[PDB]
Design a protein around this nucleic acid. Structure first.
Lengths: 79, 109, 95, 98, 92, 106, 83, 99
DNA sequence: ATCAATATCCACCTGCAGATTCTACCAAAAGTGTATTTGGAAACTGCTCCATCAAAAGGCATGTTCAGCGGAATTCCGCTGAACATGCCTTTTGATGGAGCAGTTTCCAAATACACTTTTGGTAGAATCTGCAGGTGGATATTGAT
DNA sequence: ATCAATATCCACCTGCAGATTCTACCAAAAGTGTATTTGGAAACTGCTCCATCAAAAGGCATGTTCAGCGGAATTCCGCTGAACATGCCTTTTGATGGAGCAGTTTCCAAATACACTTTTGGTAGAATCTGCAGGTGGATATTGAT
């Protein structure tokens, strides 16, 4: 599938910025699953603000507002 | 002069008191908004803005740069206990993280 | 095209008082704008709740002060409070 | 006939990625994922490019911080290799689980 | 001081005709309704402002309900809301 | 006729419309807003009371107490989630011992 | 009467009971002092906000509502009781 | 001939017992002096509604119980059954009470 | 300790993506002045409920002894991650129609604001009713010793 | 595995604190009915900027080799906790002075409500400028083999 687009070397790069030194082999599929749950929760809310405004295009603001109610405020695209 | 001194100049501020008042009103925060509220609020916003830029500016100097970028806002915020607390649930885009490796992970030496 | 208000020019003003020779990139200005708006909404929200709790129709500088003490960490609240008291004083004591 | 020991390379990688701020997942793959997931909520959607970007910044910043807590859990168990149970613990204690 | 007590009590009798409720449990039920009201209203409030709307209609309330409640509760809450408005709307 | 009867509801549409206005949520409040919101509130309290009444029954009691409300909430995935940051006074917790802590083997 | 050292009123047996409710089987001897320290910080932050609401309303009495608003501020909403 | 429960049998007996009840587990007056002491150090001359004190106690006990569950999970992760201060610290760091 | 292969640094260089500068147009603000209105402070005070002292008694904290046994320390070694160099399949970059995101105009269904009429949820306090806490005793496990 | 010691489950029983049942007053809602005001759905449309495509760019997949992690087995020390004796201090039933919360009426400083005028921050098109990101060279620290 597409989730495999998020590759081991990229997952490994994230881990490194997180200060991780050694990584187990099963971490990669574990990460993908968490990333997917994260995006689903946020995108769901973003899409809900999109539909509410009657648009067909998801806006930065829709994402920003969604991240905010998930308690994950993001600065830089407005917030 | 040109008789018409803006509320900000009266309060001695760079931030816009008229705008803040307008924003407090159209935000449905209350039925009414006293005259002193936007002044007080603008001053608080200006202060906090000065506080972060002061530290972000130093963060830039330390890297031999004259232009503050996101990276410099992140270093300034996460290296200050209080700003870090205030922005504890905030993500600054393109800010990265603080250089930090767990002691137990460094070479055996 | 409609107007898009931002705190960018006032942020730039403040930047020059604090660091006259320093500049700021566009992406950084966008971060500061988000920052001012976020603090504004947090303080206004708490002042709103405060007035509602005390069955008051008005948000005064008194509510902004308590909101600030509730929201800002120790020392930051200390200075922010004096900065606000100072501007209201300077405002009142004038024509 | 030269070879770097495991850990020496890792450590220099940590140094390197904690210094930079660029995104670490590639854009197109990430974009495809974002679109695939959204299609399940509503069909034929378009995305401002700034929206996909906001999403990538929040996702990466979310994962990096989760890896920090995961590392603290591995270390708590006296290990240097992070494992799935470390991630799970961190999420559970975080409330993303219990 | 007003409370949702008599209304919570009516719904209780509809779902469990022979069960009562202690005043403490009633007080918890009153905190619950007030809490849900405020959360739904807050979401609706922000929803209107983000869309430059000065009015909160059943449409913002519905979106607020979808944003706030977990899957299956959202579906049924929305049906009950829709149904009450459709009925209310045909009554006059 | 009350707006609650016109809508076929038990919760007070009038009260909710008023609470909407005095809470300063917007300049205006449509007529449907309070009907919908009251329906949703009535629905959630029906859901929790159904579940709490059942818990009271399993504990051989006729009167619901805080603990029955807590049992009904923590045992329901969605209600547990909606109230994930809520504490129900005198509710205690759900009986639950981690596997590894039980004695013997097999 | 001067109030001092009341944190020791949270006894070892009381802390053990709370850990039992929390599903804990074995407790190290150092847990008691660590827990008192944690409770103290927790009570400090809530009372601090509760007292700030009391003063804002110009009262001398801390109400159950003051505490309930302070708990909500900190994301620890509490039901029944004022709370 | 004597008789003695093994370390662990009593613990489990106690966990089941306390997870079953809902009464507060900290003595009441001691907790009230503690709240009066901390409050006093913030502002003198304060009175408390008795229900404000009960409210703080219900919240503190709920917070501590939930904190021990997490602490318990951290000790178990380290293959232990004894919770130690470092488990409580790991739990609070992850929770962001100081991460 | 002694090289040998790299990685890391630093001082210098400069092309350009992004930032600064000057001009010109204007709806949207923000400041100003008049007239009308009102939220909530002040002064008086009814009355709730908070602080406090009293006294009796047993629930429960404290302090000790002593043994069960968890967990850190140590040695052993299976096998999993990580380094590394090979080969190209995917992502990245920049050029292009067209889908919608927005700006603008219209006008009516729907929301204020206002004056009454009428219904109801609160509550004050009486009382009466009733679920279950809590003490009791005995059938049923669940443990620990052997 | 049969026993003995104990804790737990559990249905029956009853005094009683907390609960649902009122009679009666009603200030505050909530509902009914014009009159006036307007927010925002709806239709039409221009300019973005988003999805798509092709050529140029560079990061990832893959297999061999092996360092070294961390779980398994073993050991034993010293902490934790069961059991138990003792006695304090919390809990409980009461009552009382009075702080201070909260209800009520009075009344003006301050906020709302237009209406008219001046200024200003935002947008668009053009021109010009510059901080620093990558790139090169050469020094030298770092790491791994011996």
């Amino acid at each position: 599938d597409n989730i495999q687009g998020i590759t081991k070397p990229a997952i490994r790069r994230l881990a490194r910025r997180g200060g991780v030194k050694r990584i187990s082999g099963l971490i990669y599929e574990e990460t993908r699953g968490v990333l997917k749950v994260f995006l689903e929760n946020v995108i769901r809310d973003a899409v809900t603000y999109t539909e509410h405004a009657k648009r067909k295009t998801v806006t930065a603001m829709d994402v920003v507002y969604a991240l905010k109610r998930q308690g994950r405020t993001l600065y830089g695209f407005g917030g | 002069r040109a008789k018409a001194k803006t509320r900000s100049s009266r309060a001695g501020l760079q931030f816009p008191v008229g705008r803040v008042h307008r924003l407090l009103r159209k935000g449905n925060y209350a039925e009414r908004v006293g005259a002193g509220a936007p002044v007080y609020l603008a001053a608080v916003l200006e202060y906090l803005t000065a506080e972060i830029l002061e530290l972000a500016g130093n963060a830039a100097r330390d890297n031999k740069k004259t232009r503050i970028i996101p990276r410099h806002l992140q270093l300034a915020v996460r290296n200050d206990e209080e700003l870090n607390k205030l922005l504890g649930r905030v993500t600054i885009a393109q800010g990265g993280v603080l250089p930090n490796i767990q002691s137990v992970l460094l070479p055996k030496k | 095209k409609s107007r898009k208000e931002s705190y960018a020019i006032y942020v730039y003003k403040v930047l020059k008082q604090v660091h006259p020779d320093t500049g700021i990139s566009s992406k950084a200005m966008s971060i500061m704008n988000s920052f001012v708006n976020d603090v504004f909404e947090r303080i206004a929200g708490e002042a709103s709740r405060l007035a509602h709790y005390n069955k008051r129709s008005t948000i005064t500088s008194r509510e902004i002060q308590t909101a600030v003490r509730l929201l800002l960490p120790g020392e930051l609240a200390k200075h922010a409070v004096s900065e606000g008291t100072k501007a209201v004083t300077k405002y009142t004591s004038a024509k | 006939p030269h070879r770097y020991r495991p850990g020496t390379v890792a450590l220099r990688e940590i140094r390197r990625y904690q210094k930079s701020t660029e995104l670490l997942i590639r854009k197109l793959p990430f974009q495809r994922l974002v679109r695939e997931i959204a299609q399940d909520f509503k069909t034929d959607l378009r995305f401002q490019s700034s929206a996909v970007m906001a999403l990538q910044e929040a996702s990466e910043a979310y994962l990096v911080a989760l890896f920090e807590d995961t590392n603290l859990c591995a270390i708590h168990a006296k290990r240097v290799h992070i494992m799935p149970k470390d991630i799970q613990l961190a999420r559970r204690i975080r409330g993303e689980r219990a």
